[PDB]
Amino acid sequence: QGPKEPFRDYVDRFYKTLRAEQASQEVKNWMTETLLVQNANPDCKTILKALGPGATLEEMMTACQGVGGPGHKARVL
Amino acid sequence: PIVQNLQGQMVHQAISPRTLNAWVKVVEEKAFSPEVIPMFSALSEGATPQDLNTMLNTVGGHQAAMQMLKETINEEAAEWDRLHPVHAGPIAPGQMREPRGSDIAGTTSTLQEQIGWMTHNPPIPVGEIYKRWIILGLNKIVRMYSPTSILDIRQGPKEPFRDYVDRFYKTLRAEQASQEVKNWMTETLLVQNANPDCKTILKALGPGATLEEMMTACQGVGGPGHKARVL
Amino acid sequence: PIVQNLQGQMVHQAISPRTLNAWVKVVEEKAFSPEVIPMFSALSEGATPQDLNTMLNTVGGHQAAMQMLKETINEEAAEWDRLHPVHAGPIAPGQMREPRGSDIAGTTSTLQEQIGWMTHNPPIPVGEIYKRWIILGLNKIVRMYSPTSILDIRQGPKEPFRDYVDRFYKTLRAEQASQEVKNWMTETLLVQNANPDCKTILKALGPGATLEEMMTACQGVGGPGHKARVL
Amino acid sequence: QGPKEPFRDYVDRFYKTLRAEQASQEVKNWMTETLLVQNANPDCKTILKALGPGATLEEMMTACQGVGGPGHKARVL
Amino acid sequence: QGPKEPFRDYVDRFYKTLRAEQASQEVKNWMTETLLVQNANPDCKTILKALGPGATLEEMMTACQGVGGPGHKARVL
Amino acid sequence: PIVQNLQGQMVHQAISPRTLNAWVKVVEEKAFSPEVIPMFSALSEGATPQDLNTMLNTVGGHQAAMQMLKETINEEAAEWDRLHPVHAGPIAPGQMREPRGSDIAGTTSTLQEQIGWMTHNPPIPVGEIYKRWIILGLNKIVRMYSPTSILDIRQGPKEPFRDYVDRFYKTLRAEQASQEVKNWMTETLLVQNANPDCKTILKALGPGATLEEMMTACQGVGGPGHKARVL
Amino acid sequence: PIVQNLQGQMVHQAISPRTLNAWVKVVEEKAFSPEVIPMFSALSEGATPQDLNTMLNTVGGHQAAMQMLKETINEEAAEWDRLHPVHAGPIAPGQMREPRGSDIAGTTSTLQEQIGWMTHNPPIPVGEIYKRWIILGLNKIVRMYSPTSILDIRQGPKEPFRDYVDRFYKTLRAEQASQEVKNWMTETLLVQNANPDCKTILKALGPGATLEEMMTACQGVGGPGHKARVL
């Protein structure tokens, strides 16, 4: 993920190439835990690390609809 | 999907490619819009579990939303399997082996066996429950999509009542709440977030006001007439 | 909808997706126009209550207007047991329950119950009544859509009769009045609302002058009744 | 109704004209209901709009009787 | 009702003398509809008249809970 | 009212003088405050309508409110006498004749007769309904006595959450709304009418916490989210 | 509460007006102070959930603590029900149901029903349990009340030991920590938080002794204001 690249584009790019997985279901789950913070840009990585381990995709998706993209307005409630 | 009754016993016919092209076009045009959720239900006919995954699997770009939805389906399927028509141990020969959470879907069920448990004895609503779980996942996706809350909608200095109302209904559509709660709020929130000029007109409408009367009251130019000095 | 005649008894099937696509596109572009109202009546042959309900729920851009229609169906359903027969409550075993006000639509009664009372016993016009109520809602939407009144619509100084008369007809569609009263109003209307250039030749056709004769005169004069200088 | 014209003169002038109209009752009732409010002066029109739809001449005149003058307030003339 | 006397002050005074009236219950109720507006000041009276005929004490109190002071935009101190 | 069981069958006794004097003083001290509503129910020990009516009849200065309460009680009696069974005119000998809506009232009933229906034939709940009607009228009075309402509550620029919530708790017993609505209102109101400094603190805590947890979060931060710290 | 036993069987008498006034006045004048907790034990002679609930509901302006306390009671009732589910559901004919965890709450069960399981059949201490739950709620409330914390206490320059020791003991009331931990803390805090002039006196007194001996020395040396200033 680039510094000006939004989180949603990065997630779509990950899921789009994950279609071509050609690998185990166990491996996909195992990768999914680390990959999101691992390939993240420095701007969004701080939040992803703050959420930390033991978080589902729904929980992370909910958190990430609050951070937005570069030059955006803050979200609160 | 399964079809035929009065002209003989039901037969599973392959879903139309025209419908698949329309689904791709709807996804390209407005993937995350709330209007997609009843459109999917409306197009769905003769629930055969295997066919229900075709809409999910033929999706283009927004694969991530479908993958998140599958985790919701898995949670619902597991909850159903363990708390509702739960079965585990031995069962008599020939029996349809009381379907498990994964077996309700095409994931661990093969088509000839699946069709067999649908047509041999009285209907089993396996596709119907699976379809309900998809609606529960779709309800989450519109919530994830939404960028504005119910309170974020306000009428600016030069913004018409018509376009203010449009935005209020658009965020209300994605609010996912009780019918009573939506109504109880609608009476005050429109008045609270309205611009001063229109707010005086709205404030004197009074309690128990119908949407039809609100539409007739707000129809004209909204010039001189009413005076709020009593509330 | 329920359909089948020549081959045997009627069977509940789904609306064509090809027709649904055609309906969706005209609704996207001509949403509040009365030209879509005959399409609704013509295409809704053999209507089943649940299927009619899907059309209302799948609304896009023009959602706010549709919410007033949702309220109207509920009020009409209530009126159907308050002004029209409430029809007791208790019923002897082996009879199909019979439809109460909310049972006319999809709100409280099931599809199996709807098909059951339309097939087992003489057909009940529940789909026709709901269709009638939806059309009544469309007439209300057209009424609220209207932006101008008969007195307000006056022909501009550079405006021709052909473009003015179109605005009068568009305005007239939303007036909801008896034909005799509309004729009675129409009689002096064209000379009353015409511009000064148009009025001199328009009133020169004789006593009153029928609308076809006014159109005939309009054809010969050309443009706003003067040659050249259009813009 | 002009700027200083009262409702009593205005309604009487309308009835003086109405009697010579020689036309069906439904047409008369239909034009009567909307015309009086529309051709009323701004000051009286505001009160007529506040009173609003429903009833017939008896209740409307009864309300107008209590309102008095050419609108605004009592203690002018 | 005086210039700066709110409805709450005025209504308490009206019921204070009604305690000592010693009259028929029907007559007291029947008189009350006219008496409340009759002894009201013109600023308060205009809004009381705007509520129209057939208005209960509860309805009048509900209106008087939103009238504001001895008439809005006029000093109370 | 009527009291006694172990020592023998029920005997009539009048209301205590300290209770009556305390009731007079509480009205002088605290007027129509919502705290008086549970206190009045506690003070009114033994529900005999004629004795309960004595508390209403001994009220001082705030007589104007009592007239509205009296009319409210008359409306409630009218509702009771109409909606619930009216019963036959004559009655079989030995029976005391069942109380009507107006029989609850002190004006229609005689005390010996009133005690009779609470000690001869099975006890009629006349006191329970008479108190219910009075409580319903007192509920209307707190709305009239209110100087502000929930959507008019707002946190000032320097106000700490303690000052803001002290005011909210004072108007809380003037809400008189359903628990379902009240829970939703409590969740929504506090965050949206908060000052910008407090909004950051509330945002940091976020949804998914108890009243105690939110209060603990507010307690720890100090002042409106920081203030003077001379240590 | 249910009064006496010597004369015969227990008799339900509503809470005394004098006790109710005294309780309401103490809450008003001392607010949310730690001293209100033993006063609650003192003014609650005879324990019945409904009567105890009425005392909480009679409180004036100071409603906020009562609302927080009410939520805490609900949690404790829920906890008792899931902690002990052994007697849950239907019971044999002749038994009056007997309390469930939620029936202990004054907002759940009825007054006659509450007395029934306190003396008409085997006594369950529901009132004493409700009092204990209230005390747990009060322990939580004094955390909110507290304005200064032990390590932030610094004795002023002209401030004497008598003000300082009083402040320390008053502050320590709301910590709810065990006596062994409190006694261990008490050993070093007194010389640590002391001002320079009083600190040397405590250092001089040194290890061993007891609070009476330390206070005896401090009381004997007098105030910090000297008449030479060797201090």
Chain B's closest residue to D43, CA to CA, is: B225
Closest listed residue to residue G135, CA positions, set G41, G206, G229? G41
**Whether B111 and B18 share a structural domain:** yes
Radius of gyration for chain A, computed over Cα atoms and rounded to the nearest angstrom: 13
Single residue among F118, F147, F176 that ends a domain in this structure: F147
3-state secondary structure of E63: helix
**Contact criterion met (CB < 8 Å) for A16 and B63:** yes
**Whether B105 and B205 share a structural domain:** no
Question: Taking an 8 Å Cβ-Cβ cutoff, which residues of chain F contact chain A?
Answer: 191-192, 199, 203
Q: Chain centroid to CA G85: how far?
A: 29
**Contact criterion met (CB < 8 Å) for F43 and G143:** no
**Contact criterion met (CB < 8 Å) for G72 and F215:** no
Method: NMR
- Residue G166: its H or E element: helix G161-172
The distance of E66 to chain B (nearest Cα, Å) reads 4
Collect all residues of chain D within an 8 Å Cβ-Cβ radius of residue E46: 73
Helices (H), E1-77: 7-18, 25-38, 42-50, 57-64
**CB–CB of B193/B153 below 8 Å?**
yes
**Contact criterion met (CB < 8 Å) for D50 and B226:** yes
**Contact criterion met (CB < 8 Å) for D50 and E50:** yes
3-state secondary structure of G221: helix
Single residue among B93, B119, B147 that ends a domain in this structure: B147
- Residue E54: its H or E element: none
Question: Taking an 8 Å Cβ-Cβ cutoff, which residues of chain B contact chain E?
Answer: 229-231
**Chains G and F touch, using 3 or more CB pairs below 8 Å:** yes
**CB–CB of F195/F159 below 8 Å?**
yes
Q: CATH no. for residue F48?
A: 1.10.375.10
Q: How large is the angle between the packed helices F36-43 and G49-57, nearest 10 degrees?
A: 140
3-state secondary structure of B3: strand
Collect all residues of chain B within an 8 Å Cβ-Cβ radius of residue C4: 6
Domain-located, residue F229: no
**Whether C54 and C133 share a structural domain:** yes
Q: How large is the angle between the packed helices E7-18 and F63-83, nearest 10 degrees?
A: 80
Total of domains in chain C: 2
What torsion do the CA atoms of E8, E13, E14, E15 make, to the nearest 10 degrees? 90
**Whether G163 and G129 share a structural domain:** no
Residues 6+ apart with CB under 8 A from F169: G63, G64, G67
How many whole angstroms separate alpha carbon C67 and alpha carbon D23? 42
How many whole angstroms separate alpha carbon B227 and alpha carbon B217? 15
Q: Per this entry, what is the length of chain B?
A: 231
3-state secondary structure of C11: strand
Phi then psi dihedrals of residue C70, to 5 deg: -55, -45
Touching G (3+ Cβ pairs <8 A), the chains are: F
**Whether G132 and G154 share a structural domain:** no
Provide the b/e sequence for G161-187 (b: ≥16 CB within 10 Å). beebbeebeebbebbeeeeeeeeeeee
Whose tokens are 């009487």? That residue is D12
How many whole angstroms separate alpha carbon G195 and alpha carbon G192? 9
Residues 6+ apart with CB under 8 A from B5: C11
**Whether F4 and F14 share a structural domain:** yes
Chain B's closest residue to C15, CA to CA, is: B43
Collect all residues of chain B within an 8 Å Cβ-Cβ radius of residue A19: 63
**CB–CB of C52/C43 below 8 Å?**
no
Q: How far, in Å, are C187, D47, E43, G59, G161 from residue D77 at the CA level?
A: 45, 19, 18, 58, 82
Touching F (3+ Cβ pairs <8 A), the chains are: A, B, E, G
The distance of B91 to chain F (nearest Cα, Å) reads 44
How many whole angstroms separate alpha carbon E6 and alpha carbon F221? 44
**CB–CB of B97/B91 below 8 Å?**
yes
Collect all residues of chain B within an 8 Å Cβ-Cβ radius of residue E72: 229
> How many helices and strands in chain A, by DSSP H and E?
4, 0
Q: Is B177 exposed, middle or buried (0-12, 13-18, 19+ CB in 10 A)?
A: exposed
**Whether G108 and G43 share a structural domain:** yes
**Contact criterion met (CB < 8 Å) for F151 and B188:** yes
Closest partner residue to B151 (CB to CB) among F151, F184, F192 is: F192
Domain-located, residue E75: no
Closest listed residue to residue F190, CA positions, set F147, F151, F146? F151
**Cross-strand pairs, F2:** F12
Closest listed residue to residue C27, CA positions, set C43, C10, C39, C13? C39
Collect all residues of chain A within an 8 Å Cβ-Cβ radius of residue B63: 12, 15-16, 18-19
The distance of B73 to chain E (nearest Cα, Å) reads 53
Residues 6+ apart with CB under 8 A from F108: F100, F102
**Chains C and E touch, using 3 or more CB pairs below 8 Å:** no
Collect all residues of chain D within an 8 Å Cβ-Cβ radius of residue E50: 50
**CB–CB of G104/G118 below 8 Å?**
no
Q: How far, in Å, are A12, B62, F115 from residue F13 at the CA level?
A: 81, 79, 11
How many whole angstroms separate alpha carbon G31 and alpha carbon G145? 9
Chain E's closest residue to F65, CA to CA, is: E12
Closest listed residue to residue C214, CA positions, set C162, C159, C154? C162
Q: Per this entry, what is the length of chain F?
A: 231
- How would you classify residue G159: left for phi > 0, otherwise alpha for psi between -120 and 50, otherwise beta? beta
Domain-located, residue G230: no
Percent of chain A as helix, strand, coil, to the nearest 5: 60, 0, 40
**CB–CB of D50/B225 below 8 Å?**
yes
Closest partner residue to E15 (CB to CB) among F63, F72, F140 is: F63
Single residue among G125, G147, G169 that ends a domain in this structure: G147
The distance of B154 to chain D (nearest Cα, Å) reads 27
Domain that holds residue F185: 148-221
How many whole angstroms separate alpha carbon B225 and alpha carbon D71? 12
Domain-located, residue A5: yes
**Whether G139 and G153 share a structural domain:** no
Domain-located, residue D72: no
Best of B180, B191, B193, B231 to mutate (most F CBs within 10 Å, chain F): B180
The distance of E53 to chain F (nearest Cα, Å) reads 18
**CB–CB of F24/F58 below 8 Å?**
yes
Chain A's closest residue to F187, CA to CA, is: A77
Closest partner residue to B192 (CB to CB) among F151, F180, F184 is: F151
User: How many contacts, defined by CB atoms under 8 Å, are there between B and F?
Assistant: 8
Q: Per this entry, what is the length of chain C?
A: 231
AA identity, residue C35: E
Closest listed residue to residue F178, CA positions, set G53, E58, G107, B180? B180
DSSP string, B37-75: HHHHHHH--S--HHHHHHHHHT--S-HHHHHHHHHHHHH
Closest listed residue to residue C162, CA positions, set C188, C209, C205, C198? C198
Q: How many CB atoms lie within 10 A of CB B162?
A: 9
**CB–CB of G107/G51 below 8 Å?**
no
How many whole angstroms separate alpha carbon E74 and alpha carbon B131? 64
**Whether G24 and G121 share a structural domain:** yes
Touching A (3+ Cβ pairs <8 A), the chains are: B, F
- How would you classify residue G98: left for phi > 0, otherwise alpha for psi between -120 and 50, otherwise beta? left
**Cross-strand pairs, C11:** C3
Percent of chain F as helix, strand, coil, to the nearest 5: 55, 5, 40
How many whole angstroms separate alpha carbon C189 and alpha carbon C181? 13
**Contact criterion met (CB < 8 Å) for E58 and F68:** yes
Provide the b/e sequence for F92-125 (b: ≥16 CB within 10 Å). eeeeebebebebbbbeebeeeebbebbeeeeebe
**Whether F96 and F159 share a structural domain:** no
**Whether F143 and F201 share a structural domain:** no
The distance of B40 to chain C (nearest Cα, Å) reads 10
**Cross-strand pairs, G2:** G12
**Contact criterion met (CB < 8 Å) for D63 and E50:** no
Chain F's closest residue to A76, CA to CA, is: F203
How many whole angstroms separate alpha carbon B52 and alpha carbon B43? 11
Residue F102, CA atoms < 13 Å, CB-side half-sphere: 2
Q: CATH no. for residue D29?
A: 1.10.1200.30
**CB–CB of C144/B210 below 8 Å?**
no
Q: Per this entry, what is the length of chain A?
A: 77
The distance of E41 to chain B (nearest Cα, Å) reads 16
How many whole angstroms separate alpha carbon G49 and alpha carbon G55? 10
Domain-located, residue B137: yes
How many whole angstroms separate alpha carbon C210 and alpha carbon C194? 16
**CB–CB of B64/B142 below 8 Å?**
no
Chain B's closest residue to A15, CA to CA, is: B64
**Whether B192 and B133 share a structural domain:** no
Closest listed residue to residue D4, CA positions, set D54, D42, D57? D42
